[PDB]
Every structure is written in C-alpha cells, then in structure tokens.
Symmetry: C3
Subunit: 340 residues, 3 copies
C-alpha cells in the first residue's frame, strides 16, 4: 500500500495476516512441520527515492510477528526481523545494498521456493548464502548494464557474524549468481564460499576451514503453467542435529534435488505438486543420511491479490530408522491469508 | 487511518500512544492495579477486500508495545500480539475467521468492559472463551441470514494450545453466543466448554476434565446514558494464584457480577461508575474466596475522536484477610491518550 | 510521510533502514564501538490534532528493530521502544506531555550529539535526566508565553522506576532547562536531581542519596557552519562498569567535555570533527579514570532528505592501562541510510 508518493520519494507499507493451523500425528514431535496453531503476521516497508535521473536510493524492512504465542512469558517466541537493508541503484551500472538480506544462492533456490506453505527446505536462514543472512553487501546488475533484456548477475560479500551459536554464525565470504530469462523460461547458477568460525569448527559434526554452497535452477513460467527444478550441493554448510546423541554442527556434504509443478486455473485455484530430497554424506558417526525426503501435494485458492486460502500436504518419505532422528511423519497445513 | 482504497481493497492503519500512571500505596504490591508508570502504545492494521458482490475477505493484526520498560534487558516485558486473524464473509450467509481473536464469551463480557482504564476483570487473556486466545475458528451470522435485524449468533471452535504453562494453555473446545439489539437495548448470552490439558490437571488448584464459561449481558445505550450488566459463571476456567502458598491453577467455580453506568455530556466529559464482584468457590484448601470486589468511580474527557484524558479510581473492597492473598489496596490511574 | 490530514488531525508514519558496519581490531571486545554488523531499523508514528483555536493534542511513538541478530533465539536482542508519549499544547501558555521521553538535560546535550554515528556519549538511556527515560512529565514553554522569540524553558518531573537492575532504575526527581537562540547562536543550561533507589545504593560503585546532573551548551549554527560545545558534571548518576572486578554502579563524580565542528557543503557533504572526554572521579578502588576520551573525524553525504551515507572514525585516546577496563582500540563506522 503506497502511503507516500511525492517529490520522487515513494513509500509502501505492506503486511499480511495468516490464519494457519498444522495437523500431524501426536504432538507432531515426529513429523515434518509440527502440529497445532501456526498463525502469524508480517509487517514491513519498502521505499525508493529518486535522487537524480540516473540515481535511485532505497530501503526495506520486514518483520515477523507470531500470532500463536500466548500474551504471557512466551509472547516474543519466533518474532524476528527478516529484512533490514538500504542501498543505491545507478542507471545502467548496477545497484548496491547492505544489511540483513537474501544470500546470493537464493537467486537460484528461489525457483522452487513456491509451495503454498512448505518447500524451500534448503534455503535455511542464517546459513551463509542460501537464505536471509545478516551483514551482506550485494551488488546486482539488471539487464546487463542495460544491454541485455533478462540477463542478470550478482556479487555478494558476506561479513563475519560471530554469534553465540555455531548454527547462526559465519566467517567472511564472497559469492555470486548469474541468471537468464527469456519469455517464461529461466536458467540460473549461483555459488558462494566463506570461512567457518572457530565455534563452528568446534562442533563434532562437520570438519573444514571453508563452507561452500551452490545451486542451479531451471524454470518455465507461462501459459498458467509453472515448472521448476533446482539442483545444489553444499560442503560444511548445511546445519544438522543428531537427535539421538543431542549433538550438532554441519553436514560435510549434501546433495539437494527439488522439483515443482503448478497450474493456475483462471477461476483462482492453483494446485501444486513437488518433490524434495536433501541428502547428507560423510556425516560423522553415520555416513550417508537423508535430511529431507517428501512429495508435496497442495493447492492455493486466490480470491484476488489480497485474499487466499490454501492447503499443503507433505507425504514424508523419511523413515523411522533415520539415523539423525529426522522426523518421519507427514504434516498438513491449512491456512487463510489476508494481505496488503 | 486509510492508507489504501483502490480496486475493492482497503487498508486501515491504527494505533495510540497512552501516557499512563498508576498510584497505589507503597510499591503497589498489595493493590488492585499496582503502582508506577504504565505507559504503552498500540499499533495495528485492518483491511477488507471485496472479492465479488457477495464475498468479502478481511484481516486484522494488533500489537501492544509497553512504554514503561527501560531500553535494557527488560525492553520486551509485556509486548505481545493481541490479535492476528484473517477471514471471509459471504452475503447473508455468515463470516468465518481464524487466528488469534476474541473468545465468544467476550460477546457478552464486552457489555461492561467500558471503564476509562480498569474493569473487564473476567475477560482474562489466554483463558478459553472469555478474552483474546490463539487458534480460534469463529463463525458469525449477522441479522440472521438477512432475515432479522439485530439478531446475531456465533459458533466458535477453539484449537488446543499446549503451552509451557497451565495458565496459558487449553484443550479443544466449542462455544457460542446469541444476541439481540433493538435500538439502544441489547441482550446477550454466551457459553463455551473445552478440555483441560494434562498440565492443567497437574495443578493443585482446580480439578475437572472440562473447563466451562458462560455469561449473559443486558445494556441500554441511548440518550447519552450507557447502562450495562453482566452475570457469568465458570467452572475450572478462571485462573487463580494463592500468594501465601505460591500455588496456581484454576478456581473450581466462580460467580461473576459486573455493573456499569456512564453518562456522556455533549461537551465531552463521560463520568463512570461501576461495581464488580468475582467470587471463587470450592478452592482447595480455602473454600469460598473473593477474587475481585470493588467500586469504580472515574471519568474520561474526550477532546475529539483523537485526543482524550481520564482518571479511574478503584475503591477496593477485598480484605486484608483475603485467603488467596488478593491485594486489598485501592489504585487510581491517570492517563492521556492520542489515537488515530 | 503523511498518512492522514483531515479535520484538524494529522498523522505521520516515519522510519529508516540503516545498513551499518563497525570495524575494530579483534572481536572489537576492547574497542570503542565494537566490531561487526550493526544494521538496524526504526519505525515510528507522530500525530497532532487541533482541538480548538488554541489547544493542540499530540502523540508519538518510536521503536528500534535491530537488523544484526539471527532469526534464532537472539532475534529480539536490542529491540526497544525509544519514545511513547502523549500531550497537550495550549496557545502561548505551554505544553505538557507524559510517557517515555527525553530527559531535560538532553535539552543541553543535544547541542553536541550531531556526529554521523558516534558522539553524545553522556546522553545515556535510562539515566535520570540525560537521555530517554521512562515515566517523565514534561512542561515546556516556547518563545516565553509568546513574549520572547527564541527564549525557551522547561520543567520536568521524573517518576521513580524501580527496575530489576541498578543501571536502569531511578527514584523520584525534578529538573529544568532554559535556552536562548538568536540568529544562529544558542545558549543553554539544564539541571536535574533525583533520588537513588535502595538497589542503586546497594552497588559497590557510587555512594550518595541523590543523583545529580547538569550541563551547559553553546552553539553557532548558520552559514553552513555548525559549532558546538557542551560542559557537564554529574554526581552519583553516570553508569560505570569495572571490567576487571566485574562490578557495577555509578561514578561518584564526572566531568564532561564535548566539542563538535561541521560544515555543510551545498552539494551534500558534511565533514565533521569532534572531541569528547568524560572523566570519573572518586571511583571506589580506583580514583580518577577516564570513561570516554577520543577525537572523531567523519563525514555524512546527504543525497537528499531521504538517502545518505556516512563514515565515522573514532581515534580513541583511552589507554590500555585504563583502570576500569574501558576499551582502548579505535572504531570506524560505515553506514547507508534510507529514511522516510
Ligand atoms: C446461556 C447461554 C446461551 C447461549 C448458547 C449458545 C450455543 C452454545 O454452544 C456451545 C456448545 O458447547
Ligand atoms: C560558540 C561555539 C563554540 C564551539 C567551539 C568549537 C569546537 C571546535 O571543534 C572541536 C575540535 O576538536
Ligand atoms: Br507480506
Ligand atoms: Br488502538
Ligand atoms: Br533501558
Ligand atoms: Br527515523
Ligand atoms: Br547490534
Ligand atoms: Br545507553
Ligand atoms: Mg549467519
Ligand atoms: Mg568437510
Ligand atoms: Mg488493565
Ligand atoms: Mg472442579
Ligand atoms: Mg551510538
Ligand atoms: Mg558519591
């Protein structure tokens, strides 16, 4: 919603309220998504100011407010800043921004992160280049200096975050992506590497000086059909937990294969099919083990740009034997979303 | 404040800043309301999209930001999402919404919850059907399918919330209300019942498998006079604390009677008088005990739709002998409110 | 950004996204500012309503969202309401507001708190009258009952805040400020005094019944030149931490010297130079120690009223001998700011 648009400055306030419930067996402890109320709200702003003909300055902030906590001691649980960045965009030269923003490998992973509720399992937050991470400086060039329609590339500098936790920390790093889109078809590649922190090296799972992440995608997006595929690999970068030993760290290697199909009916219904498999290799005291393995079947019903409902069913193929203790049960999510 | 109204969709951003102080004896430890600074702020959005002639989508989110914490470690104390939900209304069929919203018994208790600052003492948060609660699906029908003006009903389903805490938990439940308003007159009744969780049955106070709550209301609201009364009862649903034994749980039974009279002068002053009593029965180790017992005298002065000030004096009739250690001292609040 | 301006009421939504990084040696543990990502966002509203010809009502709220935490357990670190207050202004008689607002000694300290990123080191939050504090009642008169242009005074009452922590608490208190501004020149004095709490007196550092603070300022602000100086003294009011003994409390006495020089080029660059020294006296198990001692060199480039970037270099003169463990390393900050 545009709340200001004068003297080249324009500001958009945005948000959504999501009534959301998950159903899984038991307390959902042994399921893909958990069980029970999962309602939440988003709020954010995105602004853009025209400094001159060739220069545009911008900022964005986006917060998540859980709506499924009580008003007591647990009120803040899961509340967080998703995005907080500012930047400058110069004509046909590129843009530069810095703050909390998406990692460059998401330029690739975005292709399949389109399910009604779940999906996008390898785009972990605070996980070097695959999702939202703090202290990234990102240079992007759209349409190749203005010469090529649909040709995009990026280079991203990741600043060390020495956090209290191995899971949420990272060393310094650099990454990049290139993508081309021609009328519905898209092709993308993205790669990042970064130092691991001493804390991360201290963990019993995962061993190495450097974390690495890469992912390629392909997509078809036209004629109401959406088809997409991602392949990626990671080294010392995917966080994992051995629920049997209560031990933690990172998978020495993973190989990740996601796939999505959706069709949009003109009356509003957009069914979805997907497949996701992420498999870990060289895990200490285990060897090879699956982290994610499921088929998804779902549908979103769009009443307009502001109102939808959805269902999303994850048929979990992880087994009860799983050596890391990865949940094996299915989850269904039903939701109703107002957005502006 | 309307920040968007195009193509069916409209969105309203709202909020208030409330400078508020409470005066009670001592540190207010043994008083109705406490002592000291109580300043807070509210922010919320609420939107409505016209999907087609008969079908409307909507969403609302509302937050409480306490203004009385330092910027240190206690910064977040008392901050919380009050409401977070999305829904649909269809023609003369009904509305359905899900998320964090008001329990259906508040359809009655709303009648007397009109004091400048205090009052509404039995509309506890996270308390099955009497106040705001998470994971409620609500159906409402207005003017009885379009057939009777003023005749309303509602049915609500409460999803189990298994929280860290007996106080903020609930099992599954179902509830409803029915109300009639003829031109300044209003009559309501509401009832709900739900499972208690194991953690709830684990507490030394209150015993029973089911929680129950009901209330009836009557109001006269015209000619600048506002009159209202509620009577209600609960079993195993009102939360209580024995400050002597430091024990908690729920009151096996309560009987609740609230009364309110206010007059609105055309120049903006609205004096208020009220009486409130909530009495617990069969409390283990005690028997009958009063939870709330007071007379209220106060006033709001309305400068306009946006600015007001108030005083609210709670003449506490609870005794010093009170067997649960309920505070016996009075409390006066003084506030100044800007709202939009 | 104006989101409402009808019928005497006007509302302005405001905020900024600040991509921001500090560079110091080491983990910045022993530096002025720290080291690493320091990004954050602000969101706020401020509103004002014209009640009648002479009476205006107003409110304001402002919140700080840190952007340099993960989305894990540390998500809330550093989030806080900065301001939350409401008030009335009457014609040429004065204004009164109550809530979380700036202490009146900030009326003077404001003079030198103009650095790109650092500076204003004596304007501690939750520290009686020198910064933003909870539960303040403030009366301000402007242009002296309408009689003298440029002449201003204020009186402020500070209500006791008995917090979990000596650092963030305060007793009841009073203060004032008076300032005169004539065409670019400005002079101010401000003084406040308050009770310490029993918890504050419990600390090993600092001893006395009353906290006191005062500051004077002088400034020249015209012809693109900004020159300012502040002198201040405190008693039992400046929070301090012995890092060696891991002990805390307040400095018995301080002497505070602040200086700033900046020039605003027409093309947007505003270089800055500054000196700050604050020295504690009579500190238990220490004697005299410097709390702050640095020279600053930086600049802000203002692209427009919406977008800027800056560098702020603190050449820290504290030494490694510092008896209180005060960091001695320098810190540089680099920021990019979108604001609306
Ligand atoms: C005395 C209250 C009358 C209102 C009853 C409404 C319907 C209640 O449904 C609850 C089912 O449990
Ligand atoms: C009346 C204006 C007084 C300002 C003094 C100038 C400050 C000098 O800059 C600080 C250099 O160090
Ligand atoms: Br959104
Ligand atoms: Br409000
Ligand atoms: Br604080
Ligand atoms: Br701001
Ligand atoms: Br920070
Ligand atoms: Br501070
Ligand atoms: Mg990280
Ligand atoms: Mg390895
Ligand atoms: Mg209250
Ligand atoms: Mg019972
Ligand atoms: Mg600072
Ligand atoms: Mg002393």
């Amino acid at each position: 919603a545009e709340i200001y648009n004068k003297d080249g400055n324009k500001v958009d306030l945005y948000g959504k309220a999501v009534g959301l419930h998950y159903f899984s067996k038991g307390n959902g402890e042994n399921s893909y998504g958990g069980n029970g109320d999962m309602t939440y709200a988003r709020l954010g702003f995105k602004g853009e100011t025209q400094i001159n003909s060739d220069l545009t300055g911008y900022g964005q902030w986006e917060y998540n407010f859980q709506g499924n906590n009580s008003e007591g001691a647990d009120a803040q649980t899961g509340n967080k800043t998703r995005l907080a960045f500012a930047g400058l965009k110069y004509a046909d030269v590129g843009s530069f921004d810095y703050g909390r923003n998406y990692g460059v490998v998401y330029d690739a992973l975005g292709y399949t992160d389109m399910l009604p509720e779940f999906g996008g399992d390898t785009a972990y937050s605070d996980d070097f280049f695959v999702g939202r991470v703090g202290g990234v400086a990102t240079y992007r060039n759209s349409n190749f200096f203005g010469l090529v329609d649909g040709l995009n590339f990026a280079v991203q500098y990741l600043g060390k975050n020495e956090r209290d936790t191995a899971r949420r920390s990272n060393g310094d790093g650099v990454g990049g992506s290139i993508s081309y889109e021609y009328e519905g078809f898209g092709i993308v590649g993205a790669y990042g590497a970064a130092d691991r922190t001493n804390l991360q090296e201290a963990q019993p799972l995962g061993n190495g000086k450097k974390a690495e992440q890469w992912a390629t995608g392909l997509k078809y997006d036209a004629n109401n059909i959406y088809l997409a595929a991602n392949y990626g690999e990671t080294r010392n970068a995917t966080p994992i937990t051995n629920k049997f030993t209560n031990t933690s760290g990172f998978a020495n290697k993973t190989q990740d294969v996601l796939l999505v199909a959706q069709y949009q009916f003109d009356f509003g219904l957009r069914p979805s099919i997907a497949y996701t498999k992420s498999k870990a290799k060289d895990v200490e005291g285990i060897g090879d083990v699956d982290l994610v393995n499921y088929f998804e079947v779902g549908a979103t019903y769009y009443f307009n740009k502001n109102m939808s409902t959805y269902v999303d069913y994850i048929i979990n193929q992880i087994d009860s034997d799983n050596k890391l203790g990865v949940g094996s049960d299915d989850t269904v999510a039903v939701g109703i979303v107002y957005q502006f």
